Amino acid sequence: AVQQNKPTRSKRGMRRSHDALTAVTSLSVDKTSGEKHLRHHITADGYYRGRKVIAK
Amino acid sequence: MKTFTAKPETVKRDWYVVDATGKTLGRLATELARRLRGKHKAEYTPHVDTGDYIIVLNADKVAVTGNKRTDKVYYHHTGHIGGIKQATFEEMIARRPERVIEIAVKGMLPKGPLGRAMFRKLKVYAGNEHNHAAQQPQVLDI
Amino acid sequence: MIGLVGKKVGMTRIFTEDGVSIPVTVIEVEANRVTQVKDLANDGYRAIQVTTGAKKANRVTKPEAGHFAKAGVEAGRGLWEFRLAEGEEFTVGQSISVELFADVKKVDVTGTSKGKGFAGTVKRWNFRTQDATHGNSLSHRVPGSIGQNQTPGKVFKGKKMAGQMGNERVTVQSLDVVRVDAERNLLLVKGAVPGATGSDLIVKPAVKA
RNA sequence: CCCGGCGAGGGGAGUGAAAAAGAACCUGAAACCGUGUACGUACAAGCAGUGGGAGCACGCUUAGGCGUGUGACUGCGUACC
RNA sequence: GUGAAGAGGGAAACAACCCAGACCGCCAGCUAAGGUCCCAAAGUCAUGGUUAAGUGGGAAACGAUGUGGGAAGGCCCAGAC
RNA sequence: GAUGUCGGCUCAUCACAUCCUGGGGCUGAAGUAGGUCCCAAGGGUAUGGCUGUUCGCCAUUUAAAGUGGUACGCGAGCUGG
RNA sequence: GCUGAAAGCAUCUAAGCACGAAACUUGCCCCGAGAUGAGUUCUCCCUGACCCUUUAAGGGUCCUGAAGGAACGUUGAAGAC
Numbered sequence: 236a237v238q239q240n241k242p243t244r245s246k247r248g249m250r251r252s253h254d255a256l257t258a259v260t261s262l263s264v265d266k267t268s269g270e271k272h273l274r275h276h277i278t279a280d281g282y283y284r285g286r287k288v289i290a291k
Numbered sequence: 292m293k294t295f296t297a298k299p300e301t302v303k304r305d306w307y308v309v310d311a312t313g314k315t316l317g318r319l320a321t322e323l324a325r326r327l328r329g330k331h332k333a334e335y336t337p338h339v340d341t342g343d344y345i346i347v348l349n350a351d352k353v354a355v356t357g358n359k360r361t362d363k364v365y366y367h368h369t370g371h372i373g374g375i376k377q378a379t380f381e382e383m384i385a386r387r388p389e390r391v392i393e394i395a396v397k398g399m400l401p402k403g404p405l406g407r408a409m410f411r412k413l414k415v416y417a418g419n420e421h422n423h424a425a426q427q428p429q430v431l432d433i
Numbered sequence: 434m435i436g437l438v439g440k441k442v443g444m445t446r447i448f449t450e451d452g453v454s455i456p457v458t459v460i461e462v463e464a465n466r467v468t469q470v471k472d473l474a475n476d477g478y479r480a481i482q483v484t485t486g487a488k489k490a491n492r493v494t495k496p497e498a499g500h501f502a503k504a505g506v507e508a509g510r511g512l513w514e515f516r517l518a519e520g521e522e523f524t525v526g527q528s529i530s531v532e533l534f535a536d537v538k539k540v541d542v543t544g545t546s547k548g549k550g551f552a553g554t555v556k557r558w559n560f561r562t563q564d565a566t567h568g569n570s571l572s573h574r575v576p577g578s579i580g581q582n583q584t585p586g587k588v589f590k591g592k593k594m595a596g597q598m599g600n601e602r603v604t605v606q607s608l609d610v611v612r613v614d615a616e617r618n619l620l621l622v623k624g625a626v627p628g629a630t631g632s633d634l635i636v637k638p639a640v641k642a
Numbered sequence: 643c644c645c646g647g648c649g650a651g652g653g654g655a656g657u658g659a660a661a662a663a664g665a666a667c668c669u670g671a672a673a674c675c676g677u678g679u680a681c682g683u684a685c686a687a688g689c690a691g692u693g694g695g696a697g698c699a700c701g702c703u704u705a706g707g708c709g710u711g712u713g714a715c716u717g718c719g720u721a722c723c
Numbered sequence: 724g725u726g727a728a729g730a731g732g733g734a735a736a737c738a739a740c741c742c743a744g745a746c747c748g749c750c751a752g753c754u755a756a757g758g759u760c761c762c763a764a765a766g767u768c769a770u771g772g773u774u775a776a777g778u779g780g781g782a783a784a785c786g787a788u789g790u791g792g793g794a795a796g797g798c799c800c801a802g803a804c
Numbered sequence: 805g806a807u808g809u810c811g812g813c814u815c816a817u818c819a820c821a822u823c824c825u826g827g828g829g830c831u832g833a834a835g836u837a838g839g840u841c842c843c844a845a846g847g848g849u850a851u852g853g854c855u856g857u858u859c860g861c862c863a864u865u866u867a868a869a870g871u872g873g874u875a876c877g878c879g880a881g882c883u884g885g
Numbered sequence: 886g887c888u889g890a891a892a893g894c895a896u897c898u899a900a901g902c903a904c905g906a907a908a909c910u911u912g913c914c915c916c917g918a919g920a921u922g923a924g925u926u927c928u929c930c931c932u933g934a935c936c937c938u939u940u941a942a943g944g945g946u947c948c949u950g951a952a953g954g955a956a957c958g959u960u961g962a963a964g965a966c
């Protein structure tokens with residue numbers, strides 16, 4: 236239920252060896268606006284695959 | 292001055308070949324472990340592998356005195372509760388005759404990383420042919 | 434002898450004139466093409482590598498394509514190996530039909546069982562359920578004891594616990610052969626076989642006999 | 643003056659002997675948490691050190707075969723009150 | 724007598740048993756108990772015997788043409804067993 | 805300056821001085837069915853009535869309803885008669 | 886049990902030989918080369934130009950970026966993630 240000995244800095248860091256994050260490998264670029272966006276997502280301005288999808 | 296110590300980067304390791312036919316198991320493994328460790332070299336160092344590579348041929352023809360050919364038992368456990376298995380000297384010779392020499396030598400070598408490396412210099416074969424002629428192994432009548 | 438690779442189409446019933454209904458598992462066994470033949474001089478054992486079905490040319494990797502091209506046969510959805518019983522002889526490009534099971538009378542079917550996921554001891558090991566009432570506190574389907582006291586002081590290996598159940602290789606032995614329709618590449622065997630509809634099956638003649 | 647939400651918090655400029663004295667302010671120790679560099683570490687079992695000891699790195703050196711850090715492998719070794 | 728209040732070596736490990744009483748240092752030598760095929764420092768030493776049971780390396784009354792040695796005796800080429 | 809007990813439930817694991825199945829010798833073993841001893845631990849080895857019970861008596865089954873060790877196995881798994 | 890001496894016989898045993906059980910090793914099913922002893926087979930891909938230097942399994946620049954993989958997305962009789 237509870238520990239008999241105090242774990243160490245080492246074991247704490249070992250457990251956190253799998254806690255690191257992953258950065259996006261690359262950002263996609265739109266044909267028309269040339270903006271940078273997530274793949275399969277729309278841009279901040281509202282474009283997607285150069286078709287002027289929702290902007291309002 | 293300080294006593295000499297061998298360097299694993301400058302140590303000379305020779306290659307030898309041995310025929311196990313008719314040889315007594317224990318009295319043979321003793322000389323192997325002696326050479327695999329380097330006790331026969333004046334440059335012997337306990338924390339260094341100064342031994343030599345040794346090839347053993349015809350491991351399926353070693354001899355044992357008394358009724359050990361049928362009464363000697365090789366026990367081993369698998370980790371499960373049943374676990375305990377056993378095989379006689381005859382059964383091992385028919386299934387895997389090389390393990391007889393390896394097991395006898397493994398017990399005569401030191402326990403630990405170093406002794407585990409010495410065992411790697413031992414090449415045991417069941418027949419009279421080996422594929423290490425490139426190393427030009429010298430005959431050893433031991 | 435050797436076996437064949439097929440696909441599980443489903444189950445149905447075959448009515449006989451004697452008023453009997455035979456539950457059958459329909460197995461589609463298309464032409465099995467030999468891609469490689471192994472011997473002792475090169476591989477150390479006798480066997481044959483086969484394939485079946487089809488695959489998208491734009492999805493077949495170059496290594497796989499070169500393996501099929503060396504044999505001179507189209508690509509398939511996988512590769513499987515069969516051993517030879519000291520008297521069989523095959524050649525690359527040779528197509529094996531379901532007619533090979535015409536006079537066997539019994540077969541062993543191997544497949545990949547359905548996946549149940551993380552299963553409990555009641556379902557996975559047929560553990561007996563505790564009391565649903567009479568004071569039971571949060572221990573209705575739990576396993577109970579898993580060992581003993583200060584003696585060994587550990588749980589023995591192989592202890593039956595909860596965990597993954599299914600999605601593993603399973604073989605059913607000695608299934609009766611009901612029909613062999615080479616015109617339609619069908620093999621009807623009496624009974625159920627592992628896996629879901631559309632899964633791969635390895636069909637070998639019965640070894641028990 | 644600048645970034646920032648006419649923010650918080652910072653970077654400059656300026657004051658001062660000193661801003662690493664900037665108001666969470668003299669001095670600023672330890673536990674504890676971090677960045678960087680060197681070495682070691684993914685076939686090896688236990689009070690974690692000690693004795694021996696290769697290699698690597700670095701500083702010497704009027705090459706002087708010394709010093710510092712690391713410590714593969716190895717003998718012995720079950721904390722304190 | 725030892726431990727307690729005593730380390731070291733040996734008995735695999737083992738306060739009380741065996742050897743032996745640590746002022747400090749040495750990469751010198753001789754010994755004790757105990758040991759000298761390998762783990763593991765030192766005789767695969769020498770000589771003459773015993774054991775075949777891994778006895779050695781767990782045990783009794785009792786049982787048995789196991790085997791070695793010794794002191795006698797009985798019946799026998801008037802032919803024994 | 806806390807090692808929580810009977811029995812039940814759940815889950816078990818080992819031993820063999822073996823309950824069943826398997827292999828044998830003797831028999832005051834005709835056969836059937838038994839008695840006794842030797843080998844053998846691979847697997848298997850009841851449900852219910854009464855009682856908190858273990859045990860036990862009873863009813864009815866079974867090829868058999870084995871003997872024991874495991875903190876008289878198992879309450880950081882349940883129950884609390 | 887056969888043959889058979891020690892022991893002129895006898896004797897399953899000492900040499901030698903043949904039968905013999907759900908135990909043992911295999912045969913059946915599953916995992917399985919982290920089997921660091923890291924295995925085998927088939928197939929596929931890459932065929933630049935220089936510089937620095939304690940000059941070596943060395944470092945660095947430009948050009949090049951394959952096989953294939955991962956990522957993202959639509960998803961699954963696969964799945965806690």
Ligand SMILES: C=CC[C@@H]1/C=C/C(=O)NC/C=C/C(C)=C/[C@@H](O)C[C@@H](F)Cc2nc(co2)C(=O)N2CCC[C@@H]2C(=O)O[C@@H]1[C@H](C)COC(=O)Nc1cc2ccccc2cn1
Nearest residue numbers: 582583584805806807808809810811875876878879880884
């Ligand atoms: C309520 C009230 C009951 C009362 C006291 C309770 C309490 O203090 N709980 C605190 C728990 C302390 C624990 C669990 C301490 C552990 O770290 C060690 C433990 F397990 C070790 C352990 N415990 C136990 C045994 O071994 C044992 O018996 N108990 C343990 C449970 C209660 C019971 C217990 O003591 O019951 C008490 C009863 C009055 C006894 O009745 C008797 O007739 N006793 C008895 C019989 C004797 C016959 C012959 C000679 C002499 C005898 C003398 N005494």
